[PDB]
Amino acid sequence: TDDSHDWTKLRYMDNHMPADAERAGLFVRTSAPCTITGTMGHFILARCPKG
């Protein structure tokens, strides 16, 4: 939120003000969970099964 690089932290909007969250909490899924292979800003890279 203070505009600083931290790979273990996440920045989301929470009712008019931006708040901090955890990188471990982030998940991607189609029919089964997906393996995250890159995260930076608004972008997420993932390999997903048939969904």
Add this chain to the structure above:
Amino acid sequence: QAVVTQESALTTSPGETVTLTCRSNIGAVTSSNCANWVQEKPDHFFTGLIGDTNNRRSGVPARFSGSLIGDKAALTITGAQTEDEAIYFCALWYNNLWVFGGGTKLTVLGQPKSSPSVTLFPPSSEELETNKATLVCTITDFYPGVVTVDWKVDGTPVTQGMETTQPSKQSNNKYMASSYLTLTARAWERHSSYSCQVTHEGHTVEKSLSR
């Protein structure tokens, strides 16, 4: 000889951006009015937020900023929080004295509901030695802060003898209140079942004693 006017009440949700304003009856508010913003939390708890229009007191979160918007002083809460629920007062300087606004009650979504914790105590014996008996019903930690307390002596709704305080805000921002049912040493010894019923955000809690 100037009248500062503020919104009466404003309701927002955690995470939103909300603006409170401060209007002067004599003209546009300017930097020479040194708009001040003060917050009142329950318990007659005052803290200063902003001074001289836009100077944030030290140790006041950055979500708070002041400015002049149009012809009035404004306070913006960027990312309002549950903790920001309070009364905000603006003050304006007029060459020789200060005039305070009526204050804006701000409500912010948050603090999940909490049921009351009710306890009913019997008249102590040292008090029954006075030819008096007072049943105390204490209710704490409830939110929203609104309850209904009903007493029932021996199955029958008492309707005279009781006094219930007004919900008072505790520190955690939940409320408390107590109700008293005063009998006589004698009224005491007569009836046999006392009960203090507290109704809060739809559930009821009955605490009964047995003499």
Add this chain to the structure above:
Amino acid sequence: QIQLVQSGREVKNPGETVKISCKASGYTFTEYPMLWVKQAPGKGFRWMGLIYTNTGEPTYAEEFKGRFVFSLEISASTAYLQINNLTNEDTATYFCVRDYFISLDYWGQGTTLTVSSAKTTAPSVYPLAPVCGGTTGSSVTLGCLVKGYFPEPVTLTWNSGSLSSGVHTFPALLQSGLYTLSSSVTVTSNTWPSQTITCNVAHPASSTKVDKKIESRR
């Protein structure tokens, strides 16, 4: 850092005088003067004036020029409000405040005055112990009922103030010409009645001090 701690709340019959103190901490008294504000029960906040803690000159709001007199025990970092020939409509809370940063930055706790005719009645302090049977939970709630006193204020602590967590003190309320107050305290079921829990009550107006240990009903 900065603490402005005010005197406790008084009761005074019409006509009397009151001196409300404001003891300042954390700043150099002398470079920051004091604002006195009246927040009247309904009405909201009002500036009563400002005192130059350097020279000592007071400014009064026009509403306050007359019965009101600001002064300071410079030496002890105290500012004081004195309201003489008390009028019944002066019941309200008065705050001291530090003027700094083109406004006011810190406010005190408040000293509430209740102008009201009445004699002096000492309180009766009653222990509130749980019902005669059972009462088995992970915790336990005791209480203390301070009944029938006049005037305000009374102070109440638990175990001389060493037990403050889990305490709810309930604002005094007027009933049949007398004030009644109460307090609850909640502790783990192992604490009580194993360890002593005592209600401490003081009523300055009557020089009454009562220590009441909460005893089990059997």
